[PDB]
Ligand binder design. Sequence first.
Ligand SMILES: Cc1cc(Br)c(Nc2ncc[nH]2)c2c(Cl)c[nH]c12
Length: 270
Amino acid sequence: LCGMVWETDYHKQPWQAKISVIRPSKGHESCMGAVVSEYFVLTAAHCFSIKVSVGGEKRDLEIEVVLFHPNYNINGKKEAGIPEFYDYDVALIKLKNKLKYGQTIRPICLPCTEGTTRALRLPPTTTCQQQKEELLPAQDIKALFVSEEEKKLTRKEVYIKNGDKKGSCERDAQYAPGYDKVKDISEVVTPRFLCTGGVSPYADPNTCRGDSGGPLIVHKRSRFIQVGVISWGVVDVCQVPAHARDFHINLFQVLPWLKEKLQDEDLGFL
Ligand SMILES: Cc1cc(Br)c(Nc2ncc[nH]2)c2c(Cl)c[nH]c12
């Protein structure tokens, strides 16, 4: 029973995971993640000694393995003079021990699962396509992501540009660090990416580096479905141009991988 809260930072966002990598050159790097099953946290590949915690605990959970998307390659396009390439920027952290679900630790819904079909009160014949059409229609989609302000968790409302504004949102990748000399923007914005940020239709807050890996969520029918993983932004805000966009891995585009790694988690992938 995923994507559900009850009547308190990690009470209100119980799927949220905080990640620290303490790298032997004395600078701690931060990321976020979402609990997706009792053994797994979903996050970004580019976040990677490693400290993971859930439920706002001081405790750091014991990590078994970290699984990376086979097509992820930050260096994939250096030859073409593209410094960092974020295609397939997703990773699963497998925990050694079963998480105990509580009021501070609950899993979020993933796309193309029974959990999501139930959460959206859809019929048993609901297909993966129909879910995508409900959750990601061709328009501006109200969504949120979860951030850290002053060591507490805060929701921030954003709009995915997936209709008439999509192109405008993607083109703005030209202003990101290192992409200013890219001829074809689709070399860096692949069909794996959703796009938020900018001022139309509303003035969306932007992600910080430390928000990377955290879920991009749709709040629908009183449930929380994860639609994307925060990957990269155009400007580090933490004067904000109207071309400050954020890009997220669309989870509907990495399902072969998700299904395979999570095949034993009773998520009921379609
Ligand atoms: C969350 C986040 C990640 C990364 Br990586 C950034 N950097 C960047 N974008 C293109 C090449 N590197 C940013 C920026 Cl910039 C703002 N927010 C970011």
